[PDB]
């Protein structure tokens, strides 16, 4: 049926799909941010570890 109910259901499916796309983009960017944070933290902690090890 091509009634208003069917049109609303199709529009709702489209809304759900766009929400899924946004959610997946957010998940990907969040993982990228977490890895970037981890690598930057490791770099800085290694740089300070150099000085600490040298002194001790």
């Amino acid at each position: 049926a091509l009634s208003d109910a069917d049109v609303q259901k199709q529009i709702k499916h489209m809304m759900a799909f766009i929400e899924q796309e946004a959610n997946e983009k957010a998940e990907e960017i969040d993982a990228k941010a977490e890895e970037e944070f981890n690598i930057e933290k490791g770099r800085l902690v290694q740089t300070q570890r150099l000085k600490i090890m040298e002194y001790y």
Binding site: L2, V7, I11, M14, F17, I18, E21
Partner: protein, 770 residues
Amino acid sequence: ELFRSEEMTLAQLFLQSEAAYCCVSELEELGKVQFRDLNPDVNVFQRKFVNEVRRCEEMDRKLRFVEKEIRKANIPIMDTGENPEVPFPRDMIDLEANFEKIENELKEINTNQEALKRNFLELTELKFILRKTQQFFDEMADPDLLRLGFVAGVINRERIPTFERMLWRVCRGNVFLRQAEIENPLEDPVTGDYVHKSVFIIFFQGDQLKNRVKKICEGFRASLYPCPETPQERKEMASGVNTRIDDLQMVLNQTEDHRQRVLQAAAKNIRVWFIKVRKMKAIYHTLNLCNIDVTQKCLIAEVWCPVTDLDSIQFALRRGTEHSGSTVPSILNRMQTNQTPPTYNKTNKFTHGFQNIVDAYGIGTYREINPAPYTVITFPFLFAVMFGDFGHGILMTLFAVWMVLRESRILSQKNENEMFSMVFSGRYIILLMGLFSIYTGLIYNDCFSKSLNIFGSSWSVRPMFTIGNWTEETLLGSSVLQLNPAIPGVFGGPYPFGIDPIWNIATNKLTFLNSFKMKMSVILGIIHMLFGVSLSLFNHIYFKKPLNIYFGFIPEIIFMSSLFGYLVILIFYKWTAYDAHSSRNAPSLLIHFINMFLFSYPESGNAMLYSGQKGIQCFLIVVAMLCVPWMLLFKPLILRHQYLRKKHVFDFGDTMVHQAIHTIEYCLGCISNTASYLRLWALSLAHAQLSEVLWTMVIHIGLHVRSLAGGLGLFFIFAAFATLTVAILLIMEGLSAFLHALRLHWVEFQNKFYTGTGFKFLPFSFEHIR
């Protein structure tokens, strides 16, 4: 069906980008969807997918180039009939790689072939030069092996005299030249022709003469190449050039075989490549018309569609979704609209000719009475009323039947002949025209200008001598005489079917045929116009214009019937009433119609056709003139009332002017159209007289010969008669009658009910099949 245009409706589709290409491809295959530009703000050359369309155009250019090389070669192009769909995924990369290979390889092949052919020709010229120089150095070569300077080359034959003269005139008596013809003429290094040649050897003294002769030969467009200085060098370089020539011949043959193989492979599928790339280009250009991510990641499409095909379009979208693999389904939605729907007529193979014929003068508006179904008969019939001839109709129907039968053959074998393509597209039109022309030729009792007499003429000549006052003396005394039906037995009733045969041989033929055919033309025209006015009433009823129905149609029909339908009634009544005995006082309907309009009923001259004619005709004229104010004054006043006194842009003066124009146009049009329908009689009489004069001037010559030797002359005389009938009559007179039936339908018949202010429905259907 063909009665009126199909119910049309707008629709809009939401479809996710990933599946959008496949969905629109399914739509293209289906063919019942017409997209519209939804981003007209930005021109076509800047839209989103212009990169894709540009690359598709480049691919089409590549295919055109390869096809052109195919045509240049003798290789043929196959035809399978498959219509694969363009691959929605990025198969464009694979197709581009394939076509780039098929083009680059062919271009490299052509360039290398040209260069190697040039080298082969130069080397063969060098070989011939070496061989002939060895031949010249064979008087007595006692020594095995430097002041003298040496050159050799090749010249075009018959230039030897001029070249020798020029040498002996420039390097005055101080240079030697020997020449020898080269049998088996050779091909020019650059000029590219097979011409006879002479190999020549020149001896000279020093550097100045060397330069002189070198420049002289260069101007004489010869070619020199190096040459050996010792017999050992001659043998060595001759063997080298011979081996290189053989190697070059082998390489040439191999490369030509490679070209042939690759071109055969290309031609095996060139048509399928063309169809693939052409659809892909069309689909991307269509997606250009749709909204883009500037508003939403999901594509928006706007379309016209007939109401009945909405479910089919949804099913096509379902196929698109399944093929694309997208989980989300594309969704279609209706929406009440104001834009004008197009005109779609669901044309058929048989009705295509007639539909194009009626569309030529303007595509019908949305859902108005379509003149095609009635035209399907009335255009062949009006054509036959003029072209009426049994024999010519037989020829035309046989030709049309040949085209119909062999239509598949001609449809497959396409040619650029515009005239023949037009005729073939109209084959069914020509077939019906031939059939109705056969019928009207039977009615006229005409067959190549000669009647038939299949039932027996109603005119007996004997009662003239029996009851009448004739004798052989009167026959001797009168050159043409005449006949009368007043005496009892001359006229034994009307001929049961068609005009009586005796009129063919009667010198009084035209006197009767003119009147009969004029009355026939007027009758048919008036009835056609009345049918048109009734169709106009149908249009108004469907469109819900009671204003038009009550002012407009009804005044129009009353005016037309009272003035001109009464004329048809008068014609038929005179035919049924007045006979030979009342011939003397038989009135003239022309004069009676003039008097009807002029109110000039006289007390002298021809008497009244029937009792009460004065009163009835005065009443008819009064009603006719009253129908003019009826059309003019009423509708504007009611419009002004109900659209400016109620609810309170309407311009009363302009509305009055428009209605006055419409009324004047219609009223003058009635007269002028009833007049113009006389072109039926004009063209019929012209065709009949041209056929008669052709017969009497061509084959009367071959028939009016006492000697039996005339049977041989009839051969050529009838060849001329056949060619003349086909050219002057079947082609040109037939074309004139066809176009005048067309003009009648376009103006006289269709002005009553047709508007033709719509748009042809141009769907996104794949016609790239070409």
